[PDB]
Amino acid sequence: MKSVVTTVIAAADAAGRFPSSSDLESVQGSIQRSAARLEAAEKLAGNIDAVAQEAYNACIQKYPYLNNSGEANSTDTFKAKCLRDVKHYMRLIQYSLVVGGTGPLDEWGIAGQREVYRALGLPTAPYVEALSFARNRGCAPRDMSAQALTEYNALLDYAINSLS
Amino acid sequence: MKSVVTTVIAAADAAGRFPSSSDLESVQGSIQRSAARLEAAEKLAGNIDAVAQEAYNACIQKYPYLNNSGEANSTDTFKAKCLRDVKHYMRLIQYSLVVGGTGPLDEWGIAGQREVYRALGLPTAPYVEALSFARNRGCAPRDMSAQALTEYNALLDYAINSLS
Amino acid sequence: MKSVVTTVIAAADAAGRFPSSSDLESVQGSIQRSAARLEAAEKLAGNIDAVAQEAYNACIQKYPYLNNSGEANSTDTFKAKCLRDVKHYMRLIQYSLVVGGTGPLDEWGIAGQREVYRALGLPTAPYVEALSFARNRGCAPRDMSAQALTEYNALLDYAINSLS
Amino acid sequence: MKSVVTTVIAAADAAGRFPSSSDLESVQGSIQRSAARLEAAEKLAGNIDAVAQEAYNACIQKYPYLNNSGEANSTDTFKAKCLRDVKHYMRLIQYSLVVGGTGPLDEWGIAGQREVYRALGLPTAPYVEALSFARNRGCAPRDMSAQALTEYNALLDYAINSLS
Amino acid sequence: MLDAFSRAVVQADASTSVVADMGALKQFIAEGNRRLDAVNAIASNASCMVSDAVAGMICENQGLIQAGGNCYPNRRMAACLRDAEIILRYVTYALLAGDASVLDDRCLNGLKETYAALGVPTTSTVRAVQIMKAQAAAHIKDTPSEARAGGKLRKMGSPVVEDRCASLVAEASSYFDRVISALS
Amino acid sequence: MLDAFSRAVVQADASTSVVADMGALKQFIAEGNRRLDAVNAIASNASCMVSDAVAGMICENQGLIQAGGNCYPNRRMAACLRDAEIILRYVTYALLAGDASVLDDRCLNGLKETYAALGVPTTSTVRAVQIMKAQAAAHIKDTPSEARAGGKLRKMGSPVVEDRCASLVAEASSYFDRVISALS
Amino acid sequence: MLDAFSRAVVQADASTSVVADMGALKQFIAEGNRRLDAVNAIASNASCMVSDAVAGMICENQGLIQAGGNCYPNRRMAACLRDAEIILRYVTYALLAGDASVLDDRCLNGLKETYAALGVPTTSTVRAVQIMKAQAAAHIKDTPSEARAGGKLRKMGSPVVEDRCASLVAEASSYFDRVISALS
Amino acid sequence: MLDAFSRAVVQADASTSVVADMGALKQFIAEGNRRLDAVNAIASNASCMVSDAVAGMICENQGLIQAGGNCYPNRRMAACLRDAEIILRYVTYALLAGDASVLDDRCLNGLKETYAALGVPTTSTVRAVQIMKAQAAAHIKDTPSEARAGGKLRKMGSPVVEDRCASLVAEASSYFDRVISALS
Numbered sequence A, B, C, D: 001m002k003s004v005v006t007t008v009i010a011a012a013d014a015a016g017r018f019p020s021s022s023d024l025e026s027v028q029g030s031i032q033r034s035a036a037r038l039e040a041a042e043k044l045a046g047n048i049d050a051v052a053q054e055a056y057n058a059c060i061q062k063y064p065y066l067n068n069s070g071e072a073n074s075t076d077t078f079k080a081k082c083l084r085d086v087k088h089y090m091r092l093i094q095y096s097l098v099v100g101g102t103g104p105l106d107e108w109g110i111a112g113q114r115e116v117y118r119a120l121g122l123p124t125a126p127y128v129e130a131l132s133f134a135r136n137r138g139c140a141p142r143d144m145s146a147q148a149l150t151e152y153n154a155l156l157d158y159a160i161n162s163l164s
Numbered sequence E, F, G, H: 001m002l003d004a005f006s007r008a009v010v011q012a013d014a015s016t017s018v019v020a021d022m023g024a025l026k027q028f029i030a031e032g033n034r035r036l037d038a039v040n041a042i043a044s045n046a047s048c049m050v051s052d053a054v055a056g057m058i059c060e061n062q063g064l065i066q067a068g069g070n071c072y073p074n075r076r077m078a079a080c081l082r083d084a085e086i087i088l089r090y091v092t093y094a095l096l097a098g099d100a101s102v103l104d105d106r107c108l109n110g111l112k113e114t115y116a117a118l119g120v121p122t123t124s125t126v127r128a129v130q131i132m133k134a135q136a137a138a139h140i141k142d143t144p145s146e147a148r149a150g151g152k153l154r155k156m157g158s159p160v161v162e163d164r165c166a167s168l169v170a171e172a173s174s175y176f177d178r179v180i181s182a183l184s
């Protein structure tokens, strides 16, 4: 699963090398940057329900047609699952903040997402809008430090990019 | 040439990836660690002749047989190349400190060194002794900061290990 | 294991061939050349201890520093192993003379030798010198026939080259 | 082209080896066996027309049907080419005797022979009978020495086996 | 590949000498966080940049999406979108490294020749890259306009300085210009 | 492979929950510089550790270098030195990452079966690993002795604390013990 | 693979001792020309031997070419002819080398199991090998009968001695017998 | 590849005629033992030859081992030492076969072009080959000087004749001359 340390270990292993100067350096970066992304991970851990709720609310208000008969937000089950999905993405983002690399998002969210929503006739735009809302929503210093917000937004953009 | 940034770029490119979270974190480590290794790289650039001179002297003091007729330190030309060699290694170490990766040492010193020395009948013990002396020589804060000395010493040990 | 006959068998098998003209001719070579190399093999069989002892003595004579503290001929265990190593090579040469190919020396002596000596910090010059002494030592017909001596010296030069 | 020396050279080159003891030994074999196979080679060189004429005669006597209308020995052009074919094989055998390997026969006679005769509706039995005649025809010491006849017959059987 | 520091090392080795002038390198380190923000600015908006740039190239030349056009049919449009992203990806690598070598060796070497054999129109390619260059500049400056972005406007929220990273803007632009030079 | 942080994320994902207990991980960060020193301490001394551990394994069991012994002839001694370096290298990965998964997945998995097929003797393999375990502990504590090291003694010169990184020493030893268990 | 001489060396290396007994190997050389003749006697007649052996296996067990038989259809008959020649070829390798290892390593190892998976009757295979064993003996002795040869009779013309290479015949036979042992 | 004998065969096949004059070829056999000594002389001293010749090329041209030099840094020197041995190896092949075809086919063909692309200096390559040609001649004659050899002097101990195998010396030098011609 991709992070600062797994990447350099994997590179070192491919050449049969002990960890060397650049590997140790790279990990120092994880030490330095950890404060900002763990701040974001902690804010998200504590408030994930409300954060996911308003992102979900945003995509439904952008696409009211989803509530129509036969559409992806039209039943109590569909509604629950849509909100659940948004929360899944936020949770994987929380994970990617903790780990400091896109691994959790890559492996448990992005991989296969396009086949799944195609097979199920789920449009991708509401997913994009939910994430896009969440990306535009935060401001610093209100919600978290400016650098924590940068970490948070970067993962949101990463997710958005994967659907775009 | 292996460094913090080329390692993560190579890894990203292999996977068709834009720079992401763990790539930027890695480069932040190079920012943080650079003060220590550039301190050493400066201390070395400004005194390499003296540092290489006493290392060379030490390997000859350790192995007087090198002075005997037909041995690798017996002629004036031979003496000059051995010292030149000791200075080569220290200069590639200086490069490696600047870069913050073993790339320069790897490509321009270590690659092919075994085949060269075995071809020419050049014993590797005096190479190792000269580097070993330099590795044991430094102390902090006298010569440089403890962290700069750490960077210096790690590349010396990296070169020693390539010969051992 | 490489000999005259295993070489031609291996080539015939790669092409799915029965032994043919050139394969039988090759083995006729073994028949002719066997007397000389087996002569050397018997002399080596009967006198390997004395042959090895004097070749070992010569390399220590060339490099007295090996007796110094921390050097490779400096203790009783070290001295006994060095002589043993010299005897190993002569025995493998004895084997190669019997087989009539470098097989035994390739597989059990040369393969891995550089890695072993590097790891243990054992200089390669005394090995070369012990083998070089043995190479220059024999004369014919005192020690064996001229053609037996040719076969003997050829395997010593083969081992010397593998270390050079 | 396969001979004693090109076989061991190919093998050495595959392993990046200088010529070693078993290579030289193999070549001593070709030296030793050369007298026998060159005796055969000279006999065949000086009498190839007669050797081939009687072998061609033999196969046609064995298979009179070939003279019948529409068969392989029925016209003057056909009769000419069949004798010519027998002579081709005898010349490649002569080549192989000089070389001391089946190379010439392999490359210039056998390779493609089955495809050619299939395409042209040429029966192989007449080829085999002509060669079989030649194989049984000779006796030592009348025609050549016993070992020279061995060398001769061996290449004939080789050619016979390639069609059988 | 090389980076800004291994580049200096390569030039220092050319005269078998130490690296003594650490001037431009201290400055490189000093601008490190900026550089990271600049890369983040491009990477984070990469999909929007590529689709907008290729769309821009097309709205300026409708021939591209008509019969015989190099963005027709679907497969060609897809290939073109892919290529734009590839080029932008290598430009971001060059920016992260502070050296063009990765862009030159892995992307641009031989690209002109590849494109000429395929019949990929150089003039339209240049235009796509030109638009990406203008996008990158604005995102690095964190001054994208609502006019060009519409509903998809993104603000990076990096710490503001008066020249808005002019040095890094010129550098990114220089990498885009290498692409255009190689495809010219 | 996992690291200390993705390990925690895996455990959280087992109940599809956010990672909330960040105590052990903020602690992992707090001891990050220590961990880099510990890895530097092993990597810097790895050649000396491997040759000394294999030499140790042998001086305690002369069977290995006599006829039929598994460090005989030269080829086998070389393969053994290689394996000792490989095992130590994967242990240093585990320590850098803070998680045994790279070691389990890329080195230990299937190794016992491999060794059993070849006839590589477990008793001696375990002993070499045991010596490397003791070496590592001493180098991490930066208390290697002149007695075992002789002229090759190395001092790391890291900032001293009273416990001398006892936690990292125990963790390092746990990875070596995983090798031993796997080979057992 | 090994030959007669490297076999002696491997046995000597097992006790890390010089090769002292070179009598059996001196006799190998002394009978070298004979050995070359014996290999020549099989190789030269291999095609006749293989076809006559498989034809004999079949004429003794017609089930092989009737419905469901393992030499039916053409593809299976051809595969069988191929196999008989392969076995004969590796036997001639063994005879030229004076050691079975090339036969064991590259032909017989895993063969019984291969035939089991396929349903190739090992018993009929044994019979073809038995016939080839008998053929080889007579060609080595240079005493093939006209009864078994017909118009395909070949005479080798080797220098005759009373025992007619009894030891080599026995050795050749032992190799065929190894094949038969391996398929039983 | 061809040898002395198959070369003659190839020339005969051109006029589809038998090989009639075995004069040069009976001569080849007669000198066969000399040829084997000559190949032994070169193979047995190959390492000394290669190192002495590359070091000679270098001591005559210091530019090779200074910045920009083609034997700088360690990697290039190693590549050069390798190439010198490769060329010597293929020359010994040609000498053993008595035909240049293995040298031409497998080594020389395409080599001038490869070195040109690499910037491997032909003038230095030629000098290294020149010294090896000089070495081979002395070794084949068994007359190396202590001057050029020092402590590494080797005497082959072959049966001496007046011309000291003048024919083979000329043949050997003609192979070295082919290499030089191929590059120049």
Ligand SMILES: *C(=C)C1=C(C)[C@@H](Cc2[nH]c(/C=C3N=C(/C=C4\NC(=O)[C@H](C)[C@H]4[C@@H](*)C)C(C)=C\3CCC(=O)O)c(CCC(=O)O)c2C)NC1=O
Pocket: E045, E048, E049, E052, E053, E055, E056, E057, E059, E060, E130, E131, E134, E135, E136, E138, E139, E143, E144, E145, E146, E147, E148, E149, E150, E152, E153, E154
């Ligand atoms: C066809 C009708 C047509 C177009 C399509 C469009 C193409 C175009 N776009 C630009 C400039 C920019 N585009 C930008 C893209 C984005 N900004 C964002 O915030 C999101 C993340 C992203 C996707 C929409 C940006 C940042 C710019 C820079 C200018 C700006 O004001 O922001 C151009 C101008 C390029 C140039 O100067 O040469 C063009 C032509 N225009 C069309 O006519």
Ligand SMILES: *C(=C)C1=C(C)[C@@H](Cc2[nH]c(/C=C3N=C(/C=C4\NC(=O)[C@H](C)[C@H]4[C@@H](*)C)C(C)=C\3CCC(=O)O)c(CCC(=O)O)c2C)NC1=O
Pocket: F045, F048, F049, F052, F053, F055, F056, F057, F059, F060, F130, F131, F134, F135, F136, F138, F139, F143, F144, F145, F146, F147, F148, F149, F150, F152, F153, F154
């Ligand atoms: C054979 C007679 C024989 C040995 C060889 C030796 C093997 C051995 N080594 C140790 C312990 C260590 N070895 C270390 C290695 C090094 N120290 C250094 O400073 C350099 C860089 C490097 C190479 C020499 C280290 C650090 C140790 C740790 C202990 C210490 O330093 O005192 C052991 C002991 C194993 C244990 O303690 O469980 C053994 C057996 N001993 C032999 O008998």
Ligand SMILES: *C(=C)C1=C(C)[C@@H](Cc2[nH]c(/C=C3N=C(/C=C4\NC(=O)[C@H](C)[C@H]4[C@@H](*)C)C(C)=C\3CCC(=O)O)c(CCC(=O)O)c2C)NC1=O
Pocket: G045, G048, G049, G052, G053, G055, G056, G057, G058, G059, G060, G130, G131, G134, G135, G136, G138, G139, G143, G144, G145, G146, G147, G148, G149, G150, G152, G153, G154
């Ligand atoms: C089916 C009805 C049937 C057969 C077909 C035949 C098979 C068979 N053959 C032998 C013995 C030999 N065959 C030999 C082959 C040849 N001799 C030659 O000269 C040419 C080159 C070659 C091809 C024809 C040889 C040499 C022998 C040895 C005996 C001999 O007298 O020569 C056997 C007997 C095998 C045994 O003894 O177990 C059999 C069964 N027989 C059939 O019934």
Ligand SMILES: *C(=C)C1=C(C)[C@@H](Cc2[nH]c(/C=C3N=C(/C=C4\NC(=O)[C@H](C)[C@H]4[C@@H](*)C)C(C)=C\3CCC(=O)O)c(CCC(=O)O)c2C)NC1=O
Pocket: H045, H048, H049, H052, H053, H055, H056, H057, H059, H060, H130, H131, H134, H135, H136, H138, H139, H143, H144, H145, H146, H147, H148, H149, H150, H152, H153, H154
């Ligand atoms: C640099 C200052 C410098 C050199 C290095 C050296 C290079 C050189 N060597 C020769 C000639 C020979 N070298 C030989 C090599 C060997 N002889 C041996 O006995 C051992 C086994 C082996 C390695 C030492 C041989 C046999 C020769 C042939 C001449 C002779 O033996 O006397 C030359 C001369 C090449 C020529 O004639 O063009 C050179 C330049 N010389 C240096 O100046």
Ligand SMILES: *[C@@H](C)[C@H]1/C(=C/C2=NC(=C\c3[nH]c(C[C@H]4NC(=O)C(C=C)=C4C)c(C)c3CCC(=O)O)/C(CCC(=O)O)=C2C)NC(=O)[C@@H]1C
Pocket: A033, A147, A150, B024, B025, B028, E030, E031, E032, E033, E034, E035, E036, E037, E038, E040, E140, E141, E142, E158, E159, E160, E161, E162, E163, E164, E165, E168
């Ligand atoms: C041009 C690119 C921008 C701009 C950039 C600036 N960024 C500045 C500081 C800064 N940026 C970061 C984030 C960066 N560092 C990282 O380690 C990572 C990811 C791992 C990223 C994305 C940090 C941590 C900092 C330092 C703390 C801070 O300043 O808040 C910055 C100020 C420093 C300087 O002057 O170089 C600038 C100017 N500013 C602009 O105006 C345009 C839009």
Ligand SMILES: *[C@@H](C)[C@H]1/C(=C/C2=NC(=C\c3[nH]c(C[C@H]4NC(=O)C(C=C)=C4C)c(C)c3CCC(=O)O)/C(CCC(=O)O)=C2C)NC(=O)[C@@H]1C
Pocket: A021, A024, A025, A028, B033, B146, B147, B150, F030, F031, F032, F033, F034, F035, F036, F037, F038, F040, F140, F141, F142, F158, F159, F160, F161, F162, F163, F164, F165, F168
């Ligand atoms: C147990 C392993 C050691 C020990 C280690 C300590 N190191 C401490 C601080 C420290 N170490 C480094 C170097 C490290 N950081 C890097 O970025 C890199 C490479 C890129 C390396 C090798 C730094 C920079 C620091 C902080 C500065 C300083 O303290 O000088 C340390 C103190 C902090 C802490 O308590 O965790 C310790 C204890 N100390 C020991 O006693 C044993 C021998």
Ligand SMILES: *[C@@H](C)[C@H]1/C(=C/C2=NC(=C\c3[nH]c(C[C@H]4NC(=O)C(C=C)=C4C)c(C)c3CCC(=O)O)/C(CCC(=O)O)=C2C)NC(=O)[C@@H]1C
Pocket: C021, C024, C025, C026, C028, D033, D147, D150, G030, G031, G032, G033, G034, G035, G036, G037, G038, G040, G140, G141, G142, G158, G159, G160, G161, G162, G163, G164, G165, G168
């Ligand atoms: C049982 C195998 C035979 C038999 C064999 C004998 N052959 C004898 C001598 C001999 N054979 C060859 C040919 C061989 N040497 C080669 O170099 C090559 C091809 C490269 C081949 C095929 C030669 C040259 C010689 C020596 C000359 C001669 O003696 O005529 C031989 C006599 C020596 C001995 O007793 O070992 C025997 C017995 N003879 C038999 O009785 C059966 C049929």
Ligand SMILES: *[C@@H](C)[C@H]1/C(=C/C2=NC(=C\c3[nH]c(C[C@H]4NC(=O)C(C=C)=C4C)c(C)c3CCC(=O)O)/C(CCC(=O)O)=C2C)NC(=O)[C@@H]1C
Pocket: C033, C147, C150, D021, D024, D025, D026, D028, H030, H031, H032, H033, H034, H035, H036, H037, H038, H040, H140, H141, H142, H158, H159, H160, H161, H162, H163, H164, H165, H168
């Ligand atoms: C120029 C090359 C030399 C030289 C060579 C001569 N060698 C002569 C005879 C000879 N050499 C060998 C060894 C060779 N034959 C082999 O089978 C093998 C290995 C398989 C090798 C290395 C033998 C067996 C013989 C024949 C027996 C003998 O003469 O002792 C030789 C004399 C024969 C002839 O004149 O052609 C010469 C001249 N002699 C020289 O003067 C330079 C140094």
Ligand SMILES: *[C@H](C)[C@H]1/C(=C/C2=NC(=C\c3[nH]c(C[C@H]4NC(=O)C(C=C)=C4C)c(C)c3CCC(=O)O)/C(CCC(=O)O)=C2C)NC(=O)[C@@H]1C
Pocket: A040, A043, A044, A045, A047, A048, A050, A051, A054, A137, A138, A139, A140, A142, A143
């Ligand atoms: C900067 C002043 C912005 C701005 C910010 C406002 N946000 C408001 C409410 C709000 N925001 C979030 C998302 C935020 N909470 C989190 O836990 C995380 C990340 C983990 C983020 C990004 C939530 C869940 C809420 C509701 C709960 C709360 O009050 O914090 C807000 C209140 C009014 C409103 O709801 O719109 C403001 C003013 N608003 C702006 O206009 C500037 C640009």
Ligand SMILES: *[C@H](C)[C@H]1/C(=C/C2=NC(=C\c3[nH]c(C[C@H]4NC(=O)C(C=C)=C4C)c(C)c3CCC(=O)O)/C(CCC(=O)O)=C2C)NC(=O)[C@@H]1C
Pocket: B040, B043, B044, B045, B047, B048, B050, B051, B054, B137, B138, B139, B140, B142, B143, B152
């Ligand atoms: C620390 C208390 C040590 C110790 C240190 C001493 N070093 C002395 C002289 C010296 N050291 C070096 C190597 C140093 N110079 C460099 O430029 C670099 C790295 C680039 C290093 C590591 C040099 C070149 C010199 C001579 C010039 C000078 O004095 O600075 C020294 C003076 C006496 C002497 O030469 O030994 C001391 C005391 N000595 C110790 O015993 C503790 C362990």
Ligand SMILES: *[C@H](C)[C@H]1/C(=C/C2=NC(=C\c3[nH]c(C[C@H]4NC(=O)C(C=C)=C4C)c(C)c3CCC(=O)O)/C(CCC(=O)O)=C2C)NC(=O)[C@@H]1C
Pocket: C040, C043, C044, C045, C047, C048, C050, C051, C054, C137, C138, C139, C140, C142, C143
């Ligand atoms: C030719 C006359 C030489 C020469 C030869 C001398 N050798 C002497 C002793 C000696 N040589 C060996 C090696 C030899 N014995 C073997 O078993 C084998 C190979 C299996 C070889 C090559 C040994 C072991 C010994 C000591 C026992 C013995 O005497 O045989 C010798 C006696 C005096 C001395 O030790 O030097 C001579 C004269 N000496 C020459 O000057 C020419 C060139």
Ligand SMILES: *[C@H](C)[C@H]1/C(=C/C2=NC(=C\c3[nH]c(C[C@H]4NC(=O)C(C=C)=C4C)c(C)c3CCC(=O)O)/C(CCC(=O)O)=C2C)NC(=O)[C@@H]1C
Pocket: D059, D066, D071, D072, D073, D074, D077, D078, D079, D081, D082, D083, D085, D086, D088, D089, D108, D109, D116, D120, D122, D123, D124, D126, D127, D130
């Ligand atoms: C004689 C025993 C045959 C027979 C033979 C015929 N062969 C005919 C054509 C032909 N033959 C060969 C093989 C020959 N050419 C070579 O180059 C070599 C080896 C170097 C050999 C053995 C070839 C390639 C060809 C086709 C090209 C050509 O016309 O030469 C032939 C003419 C048949 C036709 O034109 O359809 C005949 C009659 N005829 C017999 O009765 C017995 C079976």
Ligand SMILES: *[C@H](C)[C@H]1/C(=C/C2=NC(=C\c3[nH]c(C[C@H]4NC(=O)C(C=C)=C4C)c(C)c3CCC(=O)O)/C(CCC(=O)O)=C2C)NC(=O)[C@@H]1C
Pocket: G054, G064, G069, G070, G071, G075, G076, G077, G079, G080, G081, G083, G084, G086, G087, G106, G107, G111, G114, G118, G120, G121, G124, G125, G128
């Ligand atoms: C003939 C005496 C048998 C018989 C033989 C069949 N074998 C069939 C397939 C087969 N045979 C082998 C072994 C062969 N290949 C090798 O590489 C080596 C040694 C290096 C040997 C001995 C293999 C591996 C295979 C399977 C792959 C293949 O078809 O080549 C076969 C075809 C089986 C089928 O397709 O049903 C037959 C008929 N069958 C007989 O009845 C007699 C006893």
Ligand SMILES: *[C@H](C)[C@H]1/C(=C/C2=NC(=C\c3[nH]c(C[C@H]4NC(=O)C(C=C)=C4C)c(C)c3CCC(=O)O)/C(CCC(=O)O)=C2C)NC(=O)[C@@H]1C
Pocket: H054, H064, H069, H070, H071, H075, H076, H077, H079, H080, H081, H083, H084, H086, H087, H106, H107, H111, H114, H118, H120, H121, H124, H125, H128
């Ligand atoms: C030494 C006498 C020269 C010299 C040689 C260099 N050659 C370099 C690279 C190189 N050489 C070859 C030819 C070699 N490889 C083969 O396979 C064969 C024949 C079978 C031969 C003769 C190749 C193909 C290559 C490229 C691939 C590689 O590096 O192995 C080289 C390195 C050049 C570079 O990478 O910059 C050197 C230095 N150079 C000298 O200065 C003297 C004259």
